[PDB]
Enzyme design. Structure first.
Site, PDB file in Angstrom:
ATOM      1  N   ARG A  23       0.803  -1.213   0.000  1.00 50.24           N
ATOM      2  CA  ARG A  23       0.000   0.000   0.000  1.00 50.24           C
ATOM      3  C   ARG A  23       0.838   1.266   0.000  1.00 50.24           C
ATOM      4  NH1 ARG A  23       1.572   3.134   4.558  1.00 50.24           N
ATOM      5  NH2 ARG A  23       0.848   2.190   6.519  1.00 50.24           N
ATOM      6  N   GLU A  53      -7.359   6.919   7.441  1.00 51.60           N
ATOM      7  CA  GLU A  53      -6.250   7.613   8.092  1.00 51.60           C
ATOM      8  C   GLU A  53      -5.680   8.677   7.154  1.00 51.60           C
ATOM      9  OE1 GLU A  53      -1.661   6.771   9.606  1.00 51.60           O
ATOM     10  OE2 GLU A  53      -3.172   5.227   9.971  1.00 51.60           O
ATOM     11  N   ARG A  93      -5.652   5.615   0.512  1.00 52.82           N
ATOM     12  CA  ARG A  93      -4.671   4.542   0.580  1.00 52.82           C
ATOM     13  C   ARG A  93      -4.902   3.669  -0.634  1.00 52.82           C
ATOM     14  NH1 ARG A  93      -2.886   3.347   5.747  1.00 52.82           N
ATOM     15  NH2 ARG A  93      -2.219   5.269   6.801  1.00 52.82           N
ATOM     16  N   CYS A 105       0.217  10.475   9.548  1.00 51.17           N
ATOM     17  CA  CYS A 105       1.159   9.954  10.540  1.00 51.17           C
ATOM     18  C   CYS A 105       2.588  10.102  10.018  1.00 51.17           C
ATOM     19  CB  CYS A 105       0.864   8.489  10.873  1.00 51.17           C
ATOM     20  SG  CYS A 105       2.004   7.735  12.098  1.00 51.17           S
ATOM     21  N   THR A 154       5.012   8.161  10.476  1.00 51.18           N
ATOM     22  CA  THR A 154       5.550   6.862  10.075  1.00 51.18           C
ATOM     23  C   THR A 154       5.325   6.594   8.589  1.00 51.18           C
ATOM     24  OG1 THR A 154       3.473   5.678  10.487  1.00 51.18           O
ATOM     25  CG2 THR A 154       5.019   5.897  12.348  1.00 51.18           C
ATOM     26  N   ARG A 208       4.041   0.520   2.585  1.00 52.14           N
ATOM     27  CA  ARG A 208       4.112  -0.612   3.488  1.00 52.14           C
ATOM     28  C   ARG A 208       3.838  -1.868   2.695  1.00 52.14           C
ATOM     29  NH1 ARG A 208       2.218  -3.907   7.623  1.00 52.14           N
ATOM     30  NH2 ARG A 208      -0.057  -3.673   7.440  1.00 52.14           N
ATOM     31  N   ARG A 221       3.046  -7.287  12.984  1.00 54.70           N
ATOM     32  CA  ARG A 221       1.702  -6.902  13.424  1.00 54.70           C
ATOM     33  C   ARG A 221       0.827  -8.148  13.485  1.00 54.70           C
ATOM     34  NH1 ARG A 221       0.294  -1.242  10.247  1.00 54.70           N
ATOM     35  NH2 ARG A 221       2.328  -0.249  10.653  1.00 54.70           N
ATOM     36  N   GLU A 249      -2.263  -3.645  12.725  1.00 57.41           N
ATOM     37  CA  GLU A 249      -1.548  -3.151  13.904  1.00 57.41           C
ATOM     38  C   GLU A 249      -2.397  -3.222  15.182  1.00 57.41           C
ATOM     39  OE1 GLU A 249      -0.681   0.949  13.899  1.00 57.41           O
ATOM     40  OE2 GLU A 249      -2.526   1.543  12.861  1.00 57.41           O
TER      41      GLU A 249
END
Ligand SMILES: Nc1ncnc2c1ncn2[C@@H]1O[C@H](COP(=O)(O)OP(=O)(O)O)[C@@H](O)[C@H]1O
Ligand SMILES: NC(=O)NCCC[C@H](N)C(=O)O
Ligand SMILES: [Mg+2]
Length: 356
Positions: free
Chosen positions: A125, A224, A228, A270, A272, A279, A308, A313
């Site tokens: 993703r 988020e 995505r 985020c 990260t 990811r 995870r 997560e």
């Protein structure tokens, strides 16, 4: 910054100090100097330090604990973001800049598990933010609806393998939603870390998922991040999964303007997720190596990978199935990020075969 907010920050800082066993990067890196240096600051959209750290204050089990309410936040509150970003992404100096987008030579990627005894499925993703829109906590209900319109209309133009249909969360049956989540396709509803970051206001307005009929290509709208973009399938054919993602992202990029930063690469909610935003993960079984998930995690970490649970997560492994992925997303290319997963997973599989 007003007084009510200052009070809450002081109390939040206090809470972090007292939590002797809290292990978040927020706790580790929010020193008194850092705290005092930025607690009176405010962005043009009115984002304060509270809006940044609140998720981590309220959820002490956070791994990171902070989010950017708007793009400005990354610099306004740099003294906190900077050390946390350097820490998470495995080295990223104040003077460093994320490299230009580079998918690399896709033909150098291999099948991750030819005999098929360890890997269940493979997924890659990325995330993107629409230019002209702030991150979740600064959005109005109307903006969620506007963005949903812009993205869904754009995705109606996808063709061939990528052609598909947009499914709003509003009006989606509970049964359909729950099945899509269970099958690892749709984002979960009600995440405590996102909620306390005020990232889920007006839910489910403006939220939904686009996918082709085979559900090997999906786009999450307004979870988020604004988007995505996901490629996934059963098995270990990383090359195909990655190639499909590249095609989709290159195509969508020609149509929609996404926020990119000279230093941080593609911007995300985020820290990260900055940079490549990528990811790459497998759902994998490694019964000998996983005989203690903390041992598994210690092994993975040396390959710069994260472990995870099966539903994502902050969840446990079920039936020995772990989500293992590249941890780093910023300060390395897309090719380098996906190669860290490939290389680490190939070696972890070798270790499993050798282990007693
Ligand atoms: N390799 C994979 N194969 C299948 N499903 C996966 C894989 N990796 C993650 N998922 C699913 O993706 C969904 C999102 O999980 P999260 O941990 O929230 O990932 P992200 O960083 O994509 O937001 C979850 O349902 C999880 O099961
Ligand atoms: N598993 C992860 O590392 N997720 C990224 C941060 C999520 C959440 N805000 C946390 O700090 O745990
Ligand atoms: Mg997620």
């Amino acid at each position: 910054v007003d007084q009510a907010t200052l009070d809450k920050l002081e109390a939040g800082f206090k809470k972090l100090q007292e939590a002797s066993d809290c292990k978040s990067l927020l706790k580790k890196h929010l020193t008194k100097d850092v705290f005092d240096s930025i607690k009176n600051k405010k962005t043009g959209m009115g984002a304060t330090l509270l809006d940044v750290i609140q998720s981590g204050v309220e959820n002490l089990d956070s791994g990171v604990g902070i989010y950017a309410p708007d793009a400005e936040s990354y610099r306004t509150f740099g003294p906190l973001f900077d050390p946390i970003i350097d820490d998470y992404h495995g080295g990223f100096k104040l003077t460093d800049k994320h490299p230009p987008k580079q998918w690399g030579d896709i033909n150098t990627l291999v099948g991750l598990d030819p005999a098929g005894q360890f890997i269940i499925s493979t997924r890659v993703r990325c995330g993107r933010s629409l230019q002209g829109y702030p991150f979740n906590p600064c959005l109005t209900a109307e903006q969620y609806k506007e963005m949903e319109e812009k993205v869904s209309s754009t995705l109606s133009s996808m063709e061939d393998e990528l052609k598909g249909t947009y499914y709003p969360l509003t009006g989606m049956s509970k049964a359909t939603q729950q099945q899509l989540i269970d099958d690892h396709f749709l984002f979960k509803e009600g995440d405590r870390f996102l909620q306390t970051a005020n990232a889920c206001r007006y839910w489910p307005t403006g939220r939904g998922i686009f996918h082709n009929d085979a559900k090997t290509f999906l786009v999450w709208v307004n979870e988020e991040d604004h988007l995505r973009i996901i490629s996934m399938q059963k098995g270990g054919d990383l090359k195909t999964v990655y190639k499909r993602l590249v095609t989709a992202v290159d195509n969508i990029e020609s149509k929609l303007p996404f926020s990119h930063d000279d230093r941080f690469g593609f911007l995300t909610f985020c820290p990260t997720n900055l940079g490549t935003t990528m990811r790459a993960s497998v759902h994998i079984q490694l019964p000998k190596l996983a005989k203690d998930r903390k041992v598994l995690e210690d092994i993975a970490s040396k390959f710069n990978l994260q472990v995870r649970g099966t539903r994502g997560e902050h969840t446990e492994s079920e039936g020995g199935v772990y989500d293992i992925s590249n941890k780093r997303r910023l300060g390395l290319t897309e090719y380098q990020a996906v190669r860290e997963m490939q290389d680490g997973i190939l070696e972890m599989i070798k270790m499993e075969k050798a282990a007693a």
